[PDB]
Design a protein around this ligand. Structure first.
Ligand SMILES: CCCCCCCCCCCCCCCCCC(=O)SCCNC(=O)CCNC(=O)[C@H](O)C(C)(C)COP(=O)(O)OP(=O)(O)OC[C@H]1O[C@@H](n2cnc3c(N)ncnc32)[C@H](O)[C@@H]1OP(=O)(O)O
Ligand SMILES: CCCCCCCCCCCCCCCCCC(=O)O
Length: 90
């Protein structure tokens, strides 16, 4: 979608810190969908014990299996509405 690339833009230009503080879940959702969308199914090696953040990211992404690139695109957008909705209610 053009929408996906727009969503991605919004998120990329956000401030690193701010009034909303995203959950780890929220972060891993956006991260995994984004990888599924841009790189496809996770086929890289999984990071080791000394890289915990790498392991979480990988598990999230791998969890998506063989989800199509369109599938992940529209789920990214759905997650954006989800979080946007949380921010609106603050
Ligand atoms: C949610 C909607 C927004 C608001 C809705 C609007 C309506 C509401 C109205 C209210 C108005 C009030 C305004 C208040 C808003 C601010 C409040 C909050 O504090 S807001 C601010 C709170 N702070 C925020 O949440 C900040 C969120 N944004 C950021 O944190 C950064 O852009 C970043 C994390 C994506 C890093 O960028 P970068 O320079 O690349 O640094 P790294 O390379 O280290 O990134 C590492 C990995 O991430 C991967 N990846 C890349 N792009 C995306 C993507 N779009 N997605 C997912 N993943 C993406 C990338 O491929 C890489 O993979 P790998 O190679 O490691 O495997
Ligand atoms: C409105 C908020 C937008 C958020 C965009 C997040 C972008 C994705 C990249 C960040 C990687 C997530 C790593 C989190 C590790 C979790 C640690 C743990 O669960 O204790």
């Amino acid at each position: 979608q053009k929408q996906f690339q727009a969503a991605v833009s919004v998120i990329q230009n956000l401030p690193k810190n701010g009034s909303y503080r995203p959950s780890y879940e929220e972060m891993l959702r956006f991260y995994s969908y984004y990888k599924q969308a841009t790189m496809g199914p996770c086929l890289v090696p999984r990071p080791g014990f000394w890289d915990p953040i790498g392991r979480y990211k990988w598990d999230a992404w791998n969890s998506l299996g063989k989800m199509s690139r369109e599938e992940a695109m529209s789920a990214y957008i759905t997650e954006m509405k989800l979080v946007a909705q949380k921010v609106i209610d603050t």
